[PDB]
C-alpha cells in the first residue's frame, strides 16, 4: 500500500514513522480538557 494546519500523511509520513526519528516534521499532540463545553475556558488553557 505504500506503492499505491498541515499534517504529513503519505509515504513521507510512513517513512517518518518507520525510521522513528527523534525530531519529525509537524509533530502534533492532541489534548482533551476537563471542561470541554466553552471556548473561553479552553482559551485559557
Amino acid at each position: 500500500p505504500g506503492t499505491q494546519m498541515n499534517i504529513t500523511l503519505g509515504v513521507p509520513r510512513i517513512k517518518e514513522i518507520i525510521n522513528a526519528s527523534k525530531a519529525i516534521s509537524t509533530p502534533i499532540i492532541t489534548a482533551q480538557l476537563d471542561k470541554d463545553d466553552d471556548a473561553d475556558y479552553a482559551r485559557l488553557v
Binding site: 505504500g2 506503492t3 509515504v11 510512513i14 517513512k15 518507520i18
Partner: protein, 58 residues
C-alpha cells in the same frame, strides 16, 4: 527503498510451533501472533474470523 528496509529487518520471523513468534536468534517478539494467532489472509471482514450473521444464514 522503503520496501527494502522493511523486508531487510522483518524477514527472519516465523510463528514457531508453540504459537510464539520469535526472531532468528530465539528472542520472542510476540507471545501469540497478533493476540489470537490468526491469519490476516483467512481473516474475515472487521478483523473477525467468522462474521457470524453470514454463516448462520448460510
Amino acid at each position: 527503498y522503503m520496501q527494502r528496509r522493511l523486508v531487510k529487518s522483518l524477514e527472519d520471523l516465523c510463528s514457531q510451533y508453540d504459537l510464539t513468534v520469535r526472531s532468528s536468534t530465539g528472542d520472542i517478539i510476540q507471545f501469540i501472533y497478533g493476540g489470537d494467532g490468526l491469519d490476516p489472509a483467512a481473516m474475515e471482514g472487521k478483523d473477525e474470523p467468522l462474521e457470524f450473521k453470514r454463516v448462520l444464514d448460510n
